[PDB]
Every structure is written in C-alpha cells, then in structure tokens.
C-alpha cells in the first residue's frame, strides 16, 4: 500500500530540511584565523618484541601503560617511559584483531576471528594473568570492543550488529541492529552516554546506550568507512573511508562540515584520531605514513614518516603528550 | 646508574619476558601452515577426517614435520576484510567435487569463480596451490548417463571418464594468470592407504626447496 513510496517521500523531505538548515560553510567562517604553521614531530621511543604485525593498540588512562596485540598470539603491556615489558599474555587463538584497556586498569579485552571476546584479570593474588570471562553469541568476527565501564563492554561484529554485555552475568543486555554491511568501528562519547559506529554500507549511525535506539544516520561517504572518532567536545566526529578521504560531521546540525582530501593521496585511511583541543587531526594511510591535518582550515600541517609498512593502528594519549603508532613491520613508535 | 633497587629488578623482569618471546617464536618457525578453501559441500570433510563457528585448527604430524590447517568456512561475512590475515601461508588447499557438474542451487562454474578470485588475489601472488578433485568413484558412474556437454557446451570429446577428467583438470589449471612464481599441483583424491597425506608432503617439500633457492638467488 505505497509503503515503499512513503519511505521515499520521507527520505526526500529530510534532505530539504538539511538544505534549508545550511546557510554558511566553515571555509568562510574560519578563513580569518591564524594557521598552526609547520608541525614537526620526532620519534622518542621504539618498542620491539612482537614477532608479527600489530593489529591494535590502546593507551591507559594513566598515560603510561600501553597494550598491543599481534598475530603471533601475544598481548604485551608496555611501560612507555622506560620501554619495559610489564606483562605478556598468551592467547588461545592467534587471529586477534582488536584489543582494549579498561578505564580502571584492572582488565584487558581482545577478540578476532574466533567470534569470542575474552577478558583478562590483571590484579590477581596468585601472581599471573588469567581469563576472567568469555563472551559468546556473535555470528561474525569481532571488529571493535570498548570498555564502557568496569562491568559493561560494547562490541561490534561482522554480522552487521552491535551488542552490550554484562561481564559478571555473561549475557548481553541490548542489541543494536540496523546496519546493512559489516560494522568496522565504534567510538564512545566522552560523557559515556552515546556512541557512533560505521559500517560497510557507507553509513554511520548514532546509538543510545540505555534506550537501544538510533537517533541519526549519516551517509556522506562513497566507500567503506574503516575509522571513526568523536571530537573532544562531543558534538562532532570524523570518519575515514577507502576513497582516501576524511569527513567531519556535526550532530546538532545533522550534516557535514568539512572534507579533508588531497590530489596526491589514493591510499585508503586505516585509522583516525584527534588532539587534546581538537585543532589537529591525525590520520594513518596505506602508503606507510601519517598526515596531520588542520581540522579548522582543512590544510595539511605535517607528516609522520618512518614506518616501512602499512600503518594499522594509531592512538593519542589522554593528556595530549605523545602519539603512538603501530604498523605491519612489527614495531611501535612514540612521537612527541 | 640512576636506577633504584626496584627499577633494576623491573629491568631484569623485562629481559626474562624477551627470552620467552624469542624461544617460542623460533619454535613456530618450524611449522607449516595450510589454508582450506572450497565451494560448499566439496568434500572438505573427507580430507580432514582422514587425519582426524569461527575458525577451525587441525594439527597432525607426518615424518618429523608439523602441519596446521585452518578451515575458514562457515564465516558469513565478506572475505575482503579478513583475507589478508592469511598472507604468508606455505600453500593453499582447494577442494572440488567432480560430481557437481550438473547440480544447481551450474555450481561447478560457481567454484571456478571462487578459484579465479583466490588464485589471482593480490595477497596470494606467490603461494602455491594444491588442488584436490573429489568424488572420483561417483563421477565415473554419473558420466555414463549425463553427458559433460551439460556443463561445457564447447566440449567436443568422448564420454570416457579419463577423457572427461582430463578436460576438467585442464580448465581449472588455465585460470592461473601467474604462470611464474606460482605453481599448481593436481591430484585425484583416493582412499588407498595414506596417499592423500603423502602427496601433500611431496608438494610442500617441493615448495620449501624452491623457496630456499630463490633466497640464495640460484633460481
């Protein structure tokens, strides 16, 4: 009964509201501010010990410890200041593709092609790290996992769904469905009340944790989006896709703000991140280096060269002091 | 100096972790990793059964050599996002059913499409392929009632199974655009003693010898 037609009418009337809402661009608003100038960073620490390629890393809230995962089947916690190894956890399955660090610092999580998320307890009276819980129920490979709290974790999987788990019980509470392609990334808001995910249908969605509902949908990109990250304020986020293009979205205006592209870049974007104040945007590419963009002027400010292979993971510490970068040549570098 | 009593003890702990990471890493370099692929019910179960959700790993030993096979079937997601995790395998095992040339769910052309994609993949530009042709004793009986012209309209030949089997093997080997640095070994699966694992041992030993020669520059 014209059910398909009503959806088309709703889709059209939505885009007119956005067009009527748009009256200015950031290019003309931000044209009268001083650029950041040249930005040069030097490598300070090089961490070695992984026998295979690093697929993920995550900083600690204390801004000293750092967990990283590699395909050789090991999780290593590092001491950044002294380049010491604090722990080394052997994994049951070597096909690990994501890892996370608990905000309290008592747990770490990992997952991959085994369709299971494992949680390890670091503070044990026996003096060794042991598996605390295994969460099963996803029908596709785990793409991302983030500790929402010491007892809650949110996980995105390759079966086009996201779930929220209760670690103590072992059962998932709410399920977030609505994506068409595989979900590749997620990012938690600084207030830990909302989160955003990007999928292979070239769309991003904003979800509410408590209600389990989708608030907004964004469809600015053209290809698969692999990275996503909130602004430090929490009212915007940036996405990186396979068309060698990064884009900035606004939640309040519910549309796009800026595009970060170059004529000499053809390689896809692997990871994206923001600085402490949000003026700088860090992006890693497949052409073996990283670019520092000016998030307000959309012009390049510097490059981070020194990796011999694909830059797979990238993270900025909580106080904005250092940037950690991993790659497929089995090395970790810290820049300052 | 500048290190305290507790800092010196932490450094000594880190050296012990380095030693453990070195010894187990060297141990894993003496294994041989294999990848199993196929088109649905191609007979992969029979191959695994001879040596007795997610990914399945099988270990077995043959003549002082350790093998590991990974079965990546059953994962209901596109392989473009996780196939690069298997770059560096010694060889790839592909299973094909000879008796599926008339069943449709035409499915033989579906397996040929999968073979073409994996053979000419950018990641797998140098790994060798060991091909298994299953259901030999069923294809011979089915060829006496259903002509091969159903699957291959351009096939002009006899109805003998030896003639038909040679034609099918030729079509699979001609999809390889990397005629150099990539070689295809073909075998018709049989249940006579352990000839199936004997062939895999012969093919992998040939792969390793040719890999060593390339490093020295001799080949």
């Amino acid at each position: 009964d014209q059910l398909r037609q009503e959806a088309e009418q709703l889709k059209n009337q939505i885009r007119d509201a956005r067009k009527a809402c748009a009256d200015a661009t950031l290019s003309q608003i931000t044209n009268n501010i001083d650029p950041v100038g040249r930005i040069q960073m030097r490598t300070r620490r090089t961490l070695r010990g992984h026998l295979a390629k690093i697929y993920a890393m995550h900083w600690g809230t204390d801004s000293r410890l750092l967990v990283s995962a590699s395909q050789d089947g090991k999780l290593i916690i590092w001491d950044s200041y002294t380049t010491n190894k604090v722990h080394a956890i052997p994994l049951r399955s070597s096909w690990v593709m994501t890892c996370a660090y608990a905000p309290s610092g008592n747990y770490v999580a990992c997952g991959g092609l085994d369709n299971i998320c494992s949680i390890y307890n670091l503070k044990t009276r026996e003096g060794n790290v042991r598996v605390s819980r295994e969460l099963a129920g996803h029908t596709g490979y785990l793409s991302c996992c983030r500790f929402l709290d010491d007892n809650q974790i949110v996980t995105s999987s390759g079966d086009t769904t996201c779930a929220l788990w209760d670690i103590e019980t072992g059962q998932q509470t709410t399920t977030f469905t609505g994506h068409t392609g595989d979900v590749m990334s997620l990012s938690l808001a600084p207030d830990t009340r909302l989160f955003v995910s990007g999928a292979c249908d070239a769309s991003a969605k904003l979800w509410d944790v408590r209600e389990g509902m989708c608030r907004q949908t964004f469809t600015g990109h053209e290809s698969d989006i692999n990275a996503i990250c909130f602004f430090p304020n929490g009212n915007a986020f940036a996405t990186g896709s396979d068309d060698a293009t990064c884009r900035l979205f606004d939640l309040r205006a519910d549309q796009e703000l800026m595009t970060y592209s170059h004529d000499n870049i053809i390689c896809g974007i692997t990871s994206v991140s923001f600085s402490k104040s949000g003026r700088l945007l860090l992006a890693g590419y497949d052409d073996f280096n990283c670019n520092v963009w000016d998030a307000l002027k959309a012009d390049r400010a510097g490059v981070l060269a020194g990796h011999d292979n694909r830059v797979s993971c990238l993270g900025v510490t909580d106080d904005g002091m250092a940037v950690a970068t991993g790659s497929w040549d089995s090395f970790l570098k810290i820049w300052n | 100096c500048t290190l305290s009593a507790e800092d010196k003890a932490a450094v000594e702990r880190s050296k012990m972790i380095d030693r453990n990471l070195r010894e187990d890493g060297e141990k894993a370099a003496r294994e041989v990793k294999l990848l199993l692929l196929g088109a649905g019910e191609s007979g992969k179960s029979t191959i695994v059964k001879q040596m007795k959700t997610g990914i399945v790993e099988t270990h077995f030993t043959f003549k002082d050599l350790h093998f590991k096979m990974f079965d990546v079937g059953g994962q209901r997601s596109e392989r473009k996002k996780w196939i690069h995790c298997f770059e560096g395998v010694t060889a790839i095992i592909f299973c094909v059913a000879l008796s599926d040339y008339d069943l449709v769910l035409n499915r033989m052309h579906e397996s040929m499409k999968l073979f073409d994609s994996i053979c000419n993949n950018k990641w797998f530009t140098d790994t060798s392929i060991i091909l298994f042709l299953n259901k030999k004793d069923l294809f011979e009986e089915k060829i006496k009632k259903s002509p091969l012209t159903i699957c291959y309209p351009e096939y002009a030949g006899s109805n003998t199974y030896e003639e038909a089997a040679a034609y099918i093997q030729c079509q699979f080997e001609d999809l390889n655009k990397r005629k150099d640095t990539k070689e295809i070994y073909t075998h018709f699966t049989c249940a006579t003693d352990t000839k199936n694992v004997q062939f895999v041992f012969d093919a992998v030993t040939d792969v390793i010898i040719k890999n060593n020669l390339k490093d020295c520059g001799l080949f």
């Epitope: 060794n128 | 003890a9 702990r13």
Partner: single-chain antibody
Framework: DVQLVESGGGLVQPGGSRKLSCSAS????????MHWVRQAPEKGLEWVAY????????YYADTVKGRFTISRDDPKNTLFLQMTSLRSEDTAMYYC??????????????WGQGTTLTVSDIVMTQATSSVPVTPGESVSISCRSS???????????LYWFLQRPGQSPQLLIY???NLASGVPDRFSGSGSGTAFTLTISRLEAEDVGVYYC?????????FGAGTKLE
C-alpha cells in the same frame, strides 16, 4: 590459597650447620623473588638474604657473607637456606617473604609463618618505643631517616608493617602513600624527605601491635626499632 611453610628449626650446637626449607603452594613460585628475614627473641626484624626470579641475582647481609647460602628449586617449589659456622647470635625466628617487581606492584605482600632456631647503611629511627591509648582516638606514628628516600624518578621508598602479638608481619603502606589491598581505609601515610608519619583514624582493638618502617632504596634493607601501642 597462598601458603609458605618453614621447616628445619631445631637446636644446634655452636659451630654447627643446619638446613632450612620454605615450601610454597598456591601461587606461581617461579615469578616471585624471595627474602629471608629473622627476628631476635626480644629485638626487631633484620634482613638476611635475597634471591631473585631465575636465580640471577643473590644478595647477603654483611654479617652473614661467607657463612650462609640461599638458593631455590623451581620445579619442586622450594626455597632453602644453608647455614654454616653458626654462632650464638644466630638465635632467631626466620621468615620467608615473597616479592614481585614491576610497575605498580606491591612487594613484601605475604610473609611466612616462621621457624625458630636456637644455637647453644641508612639508620631508621622510631620516635617512641611505646604509646598508651584507648580505642576511638587518632594516633600518629612517625619515624625518621638519615638519608633522603626520595628518588629522581619521584618515588619515595618507605614501607609500613604491623606485628600483631604472636603473628607474622603484615604490610599496611607501601611507597609511603599507597594502601595495601585488604587494609581498612583508616591508615594514612604522609611525609617528605627524611620524616614520615603514619596516621590511624578511629583506632580499635585490631590496631594493637608493633609498627615497623623499612626502606627499599639501596643494597641492604633496614628496619626501624618498632613502636608499640597499648
């Protein structure tokens, strides 16, 4: 459960030799360093020897060098100490202490039960030998150091222990500020440089005992005399 059991504490004629053993069960014995600490019948604690993980490092007290020998057997989870040329001053009670060293750990967490043997530097000063007090009142314990315990990395190495009557010592505060797990949140540590203070809020019948402060800065480990509360 974590347990350390000692054996070999008989009576020894002067100039003799004896063997002491420490059997550990309930934890990964190979990842922990071990200390030997003895206590005279009326005096306080004193450190004897130390052996690390992997047996790579061995340390001795200056008064037992060339006389004692410490070693461990990982497969059997046993720590044993060989004593030679015993004298009348080696009449004490020997403790087995476990210790692990990495960023953010708590050394000296678990002590053994003790075995008795009868044969027949930074000076740490405690303010008062005894303190009489009634429950429900705040009491402060302070001890002084000859050399500054603050390192260049920003860590102050002072530890606090509690000796309950007829019981092995228990860790309360490590690195002068951190509170050990399982300790009620009414013990507070403070101080800077050479003077440190331990504050007890809402004292009850469980705080009666002897308090010791130890430094973990240099090669030998030194304890204080000990403050008694009534």
């Amino acid at each position: 459960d974590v347990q350390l059991v000692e054996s070999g504490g008989g009576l020894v004629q002067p100039g003799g030799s004896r063997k002491l053993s420490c059997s550990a069960s309930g934890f990964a014995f190979s990842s922990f360093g071990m200390h030997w600490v003895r206590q005279a019948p009326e005096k306080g604690l004193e450190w004897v020897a130390y052996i690390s993980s992997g047996s790579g490092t061995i340390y001795y007290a200056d008064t037992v060098k060339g006389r004692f020998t410490i070693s461990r057997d990982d497969p059997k989870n046993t720590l044993f100490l060989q004593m030679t040329s015993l004298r009348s001053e080696d009449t004490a009670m020997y403790y087995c202490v476990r210790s692990i060293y990495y960023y953010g750990s708590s050394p000296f967490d678990f002590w053994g039960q003790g075995t008795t043997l009868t044969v027949s530097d930074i000076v740490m000063t405690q303010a008062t030998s005894s303190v009489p007090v009634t429950p429900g009142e705040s009491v402060s314990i302070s001890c002084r150091s000859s050399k500054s315990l603050l390192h260049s990395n920003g860590n102050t190495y002072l530890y606090w222990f509690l000796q309950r009557p007829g019981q092995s010592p228990q860790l309360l505060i490590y690195r002068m500020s951190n509170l050990a797990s399982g300790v009620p949140d009414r013990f507070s540590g403070s101080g800077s440089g050479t003077a440190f203070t331990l504050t007890i809020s809402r004292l009850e019948a469980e705080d009666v005992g002897v308090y010791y402060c130890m430094q973990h800065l240099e090669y030998p480990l030194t304890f204080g005399a000990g403050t008694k509360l009534e």
